[PDB]
Design a protein around this ligand. Structure first.
Ligand SMILES: Cc1cc2nc3c(=O)[nH]c(=O)nc-3n(C[C@H](O)[C@H](O)[C@H](O)COP(=O)(O)O)c2cc1C
Ligand SMILES: O=C1C(O)=C(Nc2ccc(F)cc2)C(=O)c2ccccc21
Length: 354
């Protein structure tokens, strides 16, 4: 390991002992990365791993998934940290508070995290002011993950507003398919509402000066039939997107939630409650299988981004061999620190030389 074991074994465990709350440590690390207090890494360090996706040059297929830099405050330091691309988001049109706190819980025994943030964003305008000048030009790729407000009348209008707001400055845009977890934003959980959403979104996209790539991020909990329906609408000529992201988080069970403090919810006695989404190593097996399914349904027509449970190099290689062109992580960055960006890259380069 070397300088990598210093975080996974010495720095981060002591930090978790000091900052017991997960979201507090999240705010602190974002505060540090916004000012540059973060180990930098040299680009062009992996010549055999450079790739071209959506016509964009990537230093390596490894990037930071959405939800970490929700407001675009520290994407520059994270690009310098080792990630080849940062997915700013999820950003809502109006500034949103999100669900009640605590909403983030560590499951260190399995290197996992259970969260129920609920799209806490600073709004379109605040995040757009941090991305307008494109300061990352030539230093990496930046995508924007668009969302809708909780009190929104027409959620598809919120996604269209996001496409029009960030379509000129972002390298790519992402829209989250509503997970079959709760009625919260599940008004678009049918095949025709998705086709309607993609139709309006692509119309707004075509109104831009450049045909900015539109990606669709799905949940690993979709059954076989709904998974096929999502792929069909995503590939139809009238509503053809540019790529997909597989996947998001999995609905946590009661036993998995009580092991990390996600359950019970203070002030909630009902059993039909969503404790949160499970990310980390327990997600890798399911999210990869879902990716392997989608890659077969699309026949490899559109690029895919494998996300979920990547903790070492062979995990990312499994996703890349399954049909993914890019890979993203989040939870392993919590448990392994900044070196996790180049660590996985090193291991991939060692596995290809055989
Ligand atoms: C605390 C937290 C917040 C997240 N916020 C978002 C988000 O706002 N938008 C989104 O598309 N995914 C969000 N995610 C999901 C991640 O982007 C990613 O899909 C998932 O965590 C991948 O699993 P992994 O971290 O184990 O690799 C969030 C995940 C966590 C743990
Ligand atoms: O975002 C989180 C975070 O920044 C943590 N610490 C951390 C991570 C990397 C780093 F380089 C320095 C400190 C957390 O413990 C955490 C826990 C649960 C959810 C999110 C985070």
């Amino acid at each position: 390991s070397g300088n990598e074991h210093f975080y996974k074994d010495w720095f981060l465990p002591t930090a978790r002992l000091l900052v017991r709350d997960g979201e507090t440590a999240h705010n602190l690390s974002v505060y540090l990365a916004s000012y540059g207090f973060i180990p930098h890494k040299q680009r062009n360090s992996f010549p055999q791993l450079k790739c071209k996706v959506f016509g964009l040059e990537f230093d390596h297929p490894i990037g930071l998934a959405a939800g970490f830099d929700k407001d675009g405050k520290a994407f520059m330091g994270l690009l310098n940290a080792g990630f080849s691309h940062i997915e700013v988001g999820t950003v809502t049109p109006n500034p949103q508070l999100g669900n009640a706190r605590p909403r983030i819980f560590r499951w260190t025994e399995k290197e996992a995290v259970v969260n129920r943030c609920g799209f806490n964003s600073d709004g379109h305008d605040a995040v757009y002011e941090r991305l307008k000048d494109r300061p990352w030009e030539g230093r990496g790729v930046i995508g924007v993950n668009l969302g809708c407000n909780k009190t929104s009348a027409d959620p598809t209008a919120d996604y269209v507003a996001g496409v029009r707001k960030f379509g000129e400055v972002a390298d790519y845009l992402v829209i989250n398919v509503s997970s079959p977890n709760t009625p919260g934003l599940r008004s678009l959980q049918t095949k025709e509402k998705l086709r309607d959403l993609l139709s309006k979104v692509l119309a707004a996209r075509n109104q831009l000066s450049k045909k900015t790539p539109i990606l669709l991020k799905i949940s690993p909990d979709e059954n076989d039939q709904n998974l096929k329906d999502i792929v069909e609408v995503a590939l139809d000529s009238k509503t053809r997107i540019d790529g997909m992201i597989i996947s998001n988080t999995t609905l946590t069970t009661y036993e998995e939630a009580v092991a990390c403090g996600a359950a019970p919810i203070p002030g909630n006695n009902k059993q039909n409650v969503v404790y949160g989404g499970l990310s980390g190593r327990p997600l890798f097996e399911k999210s990869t299988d879902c990716l392997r399914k989608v890659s077969a349904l699309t026949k490899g027509a559109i690029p895919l981004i494998g996300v979920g449970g990547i903790s070492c190099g062979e995990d990312a290689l499994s996703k890349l061999n399954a049909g993914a062109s890019l890979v993203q992580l989040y939870t392993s960055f919590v448990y392994q620190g900044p070196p996790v960006a180049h660590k996985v890259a090193r291991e991939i380069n060692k596995l290809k030389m055989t």
